[PDB]
Every structure is written in C-alpha cells, then in structure tokens.
User: Fold this.
Amino acid sequence: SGFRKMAFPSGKVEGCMVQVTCGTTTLNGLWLDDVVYCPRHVICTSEDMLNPNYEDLLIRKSNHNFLVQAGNVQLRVIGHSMQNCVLKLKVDTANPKTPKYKFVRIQPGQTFSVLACYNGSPSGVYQCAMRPNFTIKGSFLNGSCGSVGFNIDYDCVSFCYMHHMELPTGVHAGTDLEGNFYGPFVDRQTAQAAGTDTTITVNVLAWLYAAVINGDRWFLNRFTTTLNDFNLVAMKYNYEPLTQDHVDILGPLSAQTGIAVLDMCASLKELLQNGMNGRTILGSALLEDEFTPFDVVRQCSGVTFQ
Amino acid sequence: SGFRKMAFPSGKVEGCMVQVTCGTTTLNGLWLDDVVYCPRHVICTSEDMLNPNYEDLLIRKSNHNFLVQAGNVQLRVIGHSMQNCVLKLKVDTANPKTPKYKFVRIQPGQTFSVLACYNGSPSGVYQCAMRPNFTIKGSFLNGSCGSVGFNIDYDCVSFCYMHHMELPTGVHAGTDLEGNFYGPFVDRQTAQAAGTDTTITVNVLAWLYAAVINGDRWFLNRFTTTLNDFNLVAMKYNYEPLTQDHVDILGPLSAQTGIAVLDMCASLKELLQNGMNGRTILGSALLEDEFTPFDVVRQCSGVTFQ
Ligand SMILES: [Zn+2]
Ligand SMILES: [Zn+2]
Assistant:
C-alpha cells in the first residue's frame, strides 16, 4: 500500500552517460553503441546563442575538436553530423554497456524519468510529465544540458527527451532523440513564447482512482454526468477536456474499483466547480496530474513482466 | 532552476539485489561480497507471524533450504545466522558488483532513497523521510520485503534501511542493516503501537529557503522571533521543536539568501499560526518536510565531489 511518485531505476542509463567537451562549455551526452548524442549548442562559444548560426559555427569544428569522457579515457571521434538540434559524435568503440532502446516522441500528458547529470556524472532521478505546452517543470542547474528522460518496461530503455534549455520564466525545454524540439521552441537565447499550461485531466482521474484503491475513497459524491457536461466545467478551469480515448484508457481502473469513469468525472467537478478548502487526497492538497493511467496500474495493480 | 524531490541514482544498488526463496514465501535480499542480507521472516510459513518463534523456526531450516537468484543461477549457500531481525546467507561467491558501502542508523528527520523490488527485480525509486515515529510513508506491495533504502555521496552507497512490514494502518516499518528495528516495532503480525507523527520543523525551514532561492520569496514577513517563542507555536501545531543544532545546520542557507534563521522561523509561524488558504510555495499547497538542509544545498548550491 501507499502511493509515491516513483521514477524508473536508472542503472541502465547511468552507463550510457558521458562528458562532451568541445573547446570550452562542458555538458552531457548519451553514449549508445558507437555514437554519442548531445545538444548541438555544445559548439556555441561563438557570439553565444544570442543569435547563433549553427551550420556556420559547426564548420569551424573538426572531427577532433570533440573530446568525450566516459568515466576515464577519451573515446576518439571518427565522425560528426548535425541532425536538427542534436549532434552525433561517431566514436571508434561501441559502448559495451548499451541496452535495448528506442527513441520515441512522447506526447504531452505522459510521464518519464529524468536522470539529471553534470559533466557526465549522475546527480539524481525524478519523475515528470510533459506539460500540454511541451515544456517540463524540471530541476536543472548549469551544466545539465544533455541530460535525458527515459521510459522502461522490459530490460528495454525507451529514451524520449534530451534537456536543452531553461526558458526565461523558469521552465525547461528540450528535444526528442533526433533533435526536433517539443513545442515551438528554438535553441537560441531569446524570449520564447509559451502558451497555456493545462492540467492533464485524464491523469488527475487516474490519481483519484489510486486514492480510492489506496484508502481514500470519500471525495465521491452522489451525482453523475455526461462527458459534454464535464468538459464545459473542464474547459472553464483550464483542464484538458476529455474524449473517448481517455475514457477507455481508464477502463480497468473503473473495473477494479467498481466506479464508472463518468461518476469519477462527476466527483472531480464538485472538486473543480464548487469546492475550495480543507481535506486531503492521497496526501496532497492539490489535484496531482503527473500520474498517467499506466503509472497507476503499476504502482497499484497489473504487473509488467521481468 | 526548479525544485524536485530527486532520488539518488539507483544503478549501484540494482546489482546488489537478489531473490531469496526458502520453501515458499518469496522476497528480496541484498547481495554484498559473499553474503546475502534479508528479512528473517523469509523462514515464516510456520503458523505465520500471528505469533512466530523465530529461533525455533530457524532450526528446521538447513543451509540449503535457502535458494537465492541473482539474475540467473542459484548462488549456493554455505552458511546462515540469524542476527536480530536479519538473516545472513553465507554464499560461495562474492558479488562481483558490490561497491563501497557502510550500514548506518539514520535518525528520524533524515531522508533516503528506496529501491522498490519484487522477487529480486527493480520496480522503481522514490525519496522518503524517516518520520519522527520511525515509520516511513512508503509504497510497497506484497513481495517487496527486503527492499532497501540508501544514501550516496561518492561512488559509496550508505545502505540504511530494509523493508520488513506494513502496519495495520497503512504505514511501513523496517530495520537497519544489522536488524534492529527503527521504532518499537516487532516482526509479528500484531497491531503495532505508533505514536504521533511530527512534522520535521528543520526540514520545512530548509524547503522555505529553497523556495526563496528558486523564485518564491514572498512568504516572508516583517516580524521576527526567539527560538523559545517559535517552539511554543511549534509544539502546539505538532512540529518538532527547534534547538541549536538545527539553527547551525541551516547556516549557509541563511548566508546565501541573507535571511536570519530566526526571521525564517518568524514567517513560518504566520503560516503555522494565523494562516489558512490561497497561495502556493514551490508548487505545494502544504509545508513539505522531506527535504533536509543537505538535500537542498545539493538541489541548489555546493557540489559534492565526483
Ligand atoms: Zn543544452
Ligand atoms: Zn518482510
């Protein structure tokens, strides 16, 4: 029993981590097989990214302006290519310590674990969601660029995010593992647009099911609703509105608890509409939205495999 | 910038983890050098722990009623001894994958990371505090016994906790790595006393400093106080009262922010005494107490080494 926001174990990743140092400016890369993945602004000492022209900067660099460290050596680089916002760094050896992976483009609302790193060394691991405006609300100090975010199920790591920048208003932006930003963001030091951060409605509902499972089943009430109904309260309070894919994802949670998705929607509104002040759900004074319906089925219910 | 409750990277530990299976009943152990550490109630199928006599149970077992699994094999056990609430399981090989460690008896108020495991395999990692009543507010399903909690600084793992039981009221109890429970608890299935869970006052203060650092410096107010003053509000609201070791631990935080420990105490009271409703601190609607002053200095300030 209990409910914690767990990260995936990070061992499979701590040994894909390396240092990438161009001239100056030191940051992290991901060493898989015989390649190293890193933010292309490693090559920026030029006029900074107050207006950088990456393709013209990158041509002053040769194959061996690029030193990496993996615990202790070099790795010698026998090639490079810029691929949207990522560098690749062809090295001479395959990482003995590479596991099964894919890259994937997570879509907002979903969760991953971040292994925060500084010049190649693990600092910590935390769980996060990609906000509906494709930013993450992270914890990153200077030197953490290139840190990555991953999912696991088997012994198979599904790398999904690479940290690139801190926005001028405290939030974090990055790429998938082939260098396309999430969101409209660019890897320049300019003030970057950023829309409305919505609450991930489907995730809040998963968490209210967790609360019922793990003891706290007394935010429920005696009313019920339609999806059109709830969405007009939803839309109003800055929640992502729900459709039919959400209701079906919630399926077995409604089954193990014996509560219709729609009656759960029904009690959330009274929390969203006329609520405000007092009690407690699974230990939070807020509605949490960084658990997906799968995160819950794990922390309570339905084993995975290993 | 930002502030997250990070766990330590768990790779160093995922490879100290093994399965221990007696007859039936399967749970986790810790495989260090040529020894395996596990809850002694692995040997309980006897009348259950509704009243178990461990020393008489343990004598029906021989050296090789005890099978462990480490990823794939056995480890053959060439000895055993019961040491308070832990088993040891003398095995024939040293874990090739053991790192630098100690055992330590954490004291309430401090934090560690938990690697939640099931029959030898990692599920996840989360950060927690030992509550002042020597329980932890965890997330543990059936089969997680033997999961452990650890601290890191170097490449040196300081194992500090081993999960033993779930109390009848939802909370978790365990031992240090030489088998003495934290708290007055016993490894029997009986209703176990459990005193008042206090808020770790010194940790709340560390977190309010983090909020000032990481943007949120407007819970501060125009008053000040004495330690005797605050403690009488403190005592009243079920906070651990502060002394002089707390004030000094908070030292450099007061230095980087330019705020006297006592003026911080001063604003907390207005939050503790006449407060109630509205705003937001570092994203929480509650006063968080699972960051120690060291956890903060890390997530913001003062690197460690590696
Ligand atoms: Zn970067
Ligand atoms: Zn146990």
